Amino acid sequence: DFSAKVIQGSLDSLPQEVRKFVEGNAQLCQPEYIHICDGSEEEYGRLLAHMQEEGVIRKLKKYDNCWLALTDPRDVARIESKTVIITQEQRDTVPIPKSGQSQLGRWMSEEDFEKAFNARFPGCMKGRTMYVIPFSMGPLGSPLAKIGIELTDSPYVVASMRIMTRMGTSVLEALGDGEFIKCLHSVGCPLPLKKPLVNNWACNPELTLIAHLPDRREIISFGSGYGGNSLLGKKCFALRIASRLAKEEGWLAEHMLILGITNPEGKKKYLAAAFPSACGKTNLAMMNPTLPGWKVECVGDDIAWMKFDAQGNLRAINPENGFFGVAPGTSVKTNPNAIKTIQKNTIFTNVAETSDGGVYWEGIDEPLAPGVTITSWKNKEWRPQDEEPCAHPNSRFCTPASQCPIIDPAWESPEGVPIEGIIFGGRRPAGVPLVYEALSWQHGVFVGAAMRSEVIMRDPFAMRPFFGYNFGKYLAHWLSMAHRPAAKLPKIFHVNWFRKDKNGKFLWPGFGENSRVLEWMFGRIEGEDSAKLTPIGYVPKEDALNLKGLGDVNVEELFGISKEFWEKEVEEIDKYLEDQVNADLPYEIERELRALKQRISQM
Ligand SMILES: Nc1nc2c(ncn2[C@@H]2O[C@H](COP(=O)(O)OP(=O)(O)OP(=O)(O)O)[C@@H](O)[C@H]2O)c(=O)[nH]1
Ligand SMILES: [Mn+2]
Ligand SMILES: [Mn+2]
Ligand SMILES: [Mn+2]
Ligand code: NA
């Protein structure tokens, strides 16, 4: 009985299974106190102030209630080498590669994990508060939503989870005796500290391990206080656990923005888009369109949970409550709506600070007044002419979604938004045109499976680091949507903002100008005759894209399709799928590969 150590809420108030989860891990981790979070403003503000007292965060006095965390440089991002999924059989988690090393996930046996767990968690919260975070992934009481309980010894995690999820007492009441995902996190630094504390940032790099146990409905993360490793809703639940739940239950959990686009006529559609990290989902999701009369509105910028309803519409919710966005590169011109969203109630991690209490980073495109100096993310003075950057490259802001000036009116609708188009894309300097459309659902699944991005690494569906289970079975799951009764299969497109000429400059300007590409997609969904058939799919007809105001864009280079390039491309796709997917590659994906190779051979 840990009732004596409860400093907020009550163990008697908890659902029975939530109580078991809290007490079992209180016995294991031996926290000094147990704090059951209520999600209130008072809790949040007080916890922020406490972190301020401790040197854990700094207040940014230029803004309304904004904050800055600088981490230990050993704990700066997700670490894929220490990210694992536990299942009885390896094959259910990853396909058995021919070459012996999988790029599609990392399996650990139950036996090996149990040893690793026992070497980490016993007594790991000594002298710290265990916070109990009840949270909803998705709008409260949406039929597509799912509930988690996160245990953590990090106030930074509590504050960040309040922004990125719906958390507090209302979630506990909505949960009742229903099922939930068990999320256990520790920074791995029990008191008294055995090792030195760097930058007031508790972490344990040597023992860092982020584990997923889909069959036990558990996420167990040790040693890292950062982002995807500690905010257990962000990737661990949102993609890895949820993709497995999605496979079991007949839905999809994807690394996709959701946006609503409205033409000059006022006709509206919703699109989903899967790009890898560093390929601009957040820019597109809250785009300021350069084309007159067009309006883009944001539903989400990172995670899409999608399920075909009884009418056959692909319904998507954003399961997040905020944007955990990359800070460097974000400017007034690249993303004006992000700049507006993050002005208040926002936590920044690993960015630079200006002498007047403002935030700064590479590519911010806001010159400072003379006299204004900059402190870097490493807490040292920094001039533009210095070699190292002022902000870490994967530094982040964590901001409420409700503050976005163009947040979609249906962004919290419990039924979700009807998706009519799915877009894939990444960074390809050569060969791949600006935009094309898949010839069918089966081709579209192949296009997702074939995705690559800048060293050009493969990233099928932008999910390479996030697959909850066997990628081959994931492909089969996607393909099975075509045999679902009444399913209205969205049109699939592939984009490339990053094609370059032989001098290495971008052939397309991008950003708000990408609204010109979205227009074409909109029309194609409407059934307009604006498409020319090519070996790789439908591209826009000559003069079908609005290029007014761009001057002379080199269209023939931008839309050029080379036999020699695509020959090499199909061969490389073949070898990858053969190696990495092998016996689990669906028949239909092999067929699309064979078909594309054949169409290219006839060029
Ligand atoms: N050239 C060009 N670059 C772009 C465009 N859109 C975004 N970018 C670049 O993409 C980067 C920002 O994208 P990120 O925010 O890292 O991508 P994301 O998909 O949101 O990544 P996660 O948040 O990690 O999922 C910056 O380097 C931008 O300059 C575009 O239209 N053209
Ligand atoms: Mn103290
Ligand atoms: Mn993003
Ligand atoms: Mn992401
Ligand atoms: Na710090």
Concatenating the DSSP letter of every residue in 1-31 gives --GGGEEES-TTTS-HHHHHHHHHHHHHH--
Rounded CA-CA distance 71/413 in Å is 36
> Is 166 part of any known ligand binding site?
no
b/e code 9-20 from CB counts within 10 Å (16+ = b): bebeebbeebbe
Experimental method: X-ray
Contact 472, 585 (CB under 8 A): yes
256 and 155 belong to one structural domain: no
Phi, psi of 352 (to 5 degrees): -85, 160
Whether 87 lines ligand 1, by a CB cut-off of 6 Å, is: no
The CA 224 to ligand 3 mean position distance, Å, reads 21
Residue where a domain stops, chosen among 230, 250, 270: 250
91 and 214 belong to one structural domain: yes
Phi, psi of 597 (to 5 degrees): -55, -45
488 and 470 belong to one structural domain: yes
Whether 240 lines ligand 1, by a CB cut-off of 6 Å, is: no
29 and 89 belong to one structural domain: yes
Element (H, E) at 327: none
Cα–Cα nearest to 41, from 13, 65, 22:
65
CATH number of 332's domain: 2.170.8.10
| 15 cis-preceded (ω within 30 degrees of 0) | no
182 and 305 belong to one structural domain: no
339 and 424 belong to one structural domain: no
Whether 302 lines ligand 1, by a CB cut-off of 6 Å, is: yes
The CA 427 to ligand 1 mean position distance, Å, reads 10
174 and 74 belong to one structural domain: no
User: How many domains is the chain partitioned into structurally?
Assistant: 3
> Is 283 part of any known ligand binding site?
yes
Residue 293's domain comprises: 251-320+406-603
CA angle 19, 220, 167 (to 5 degrees): 55
SS3 336: helix
Residues that place a CB less than 5 A from ion ligand 3: 282, 325
Rounded CA-CA distance 296/306 in Å is 20
Element (H, E) at 154: none
Q: 279 catalytic, yes or no?
A: yes
Tokens at residue 548, please? 């007014």
Residue where a domain stops, chosen among 250, 265, 300: 250
CA angle 132, 403, 148 (to 5 degrees): 25
Which of 279, 390, 398, 404 is labelled catalytic? 279
Which atom from ligand 1 is nearest to the alpha carbon of 513? Answer: 31
Residue where a domain stops, chosen among 363, 383, 405: 405
| Resolution for this experimental structure (Å) | 1.8
Long-range contacts of residues 452-459, Cβ cutoff 8 Å, at least 24 apart: 452/426, 452/428, 453/275, 453/276, 453/278, 453/279, 453/426, 453/427, 453/428, 454/426, 454/427, 454/428, 454/429, 454/498, 456/427, 456/428, 458/103, 458/576, 459/276, 459/426
Whether 222 lines ligand 1, by a CB cut-off of 6 Å, is: no
Phi, psi of 417 (to 5 degrees): -105, 145
Rounded CA-CA distance 589/41 in Å is 50
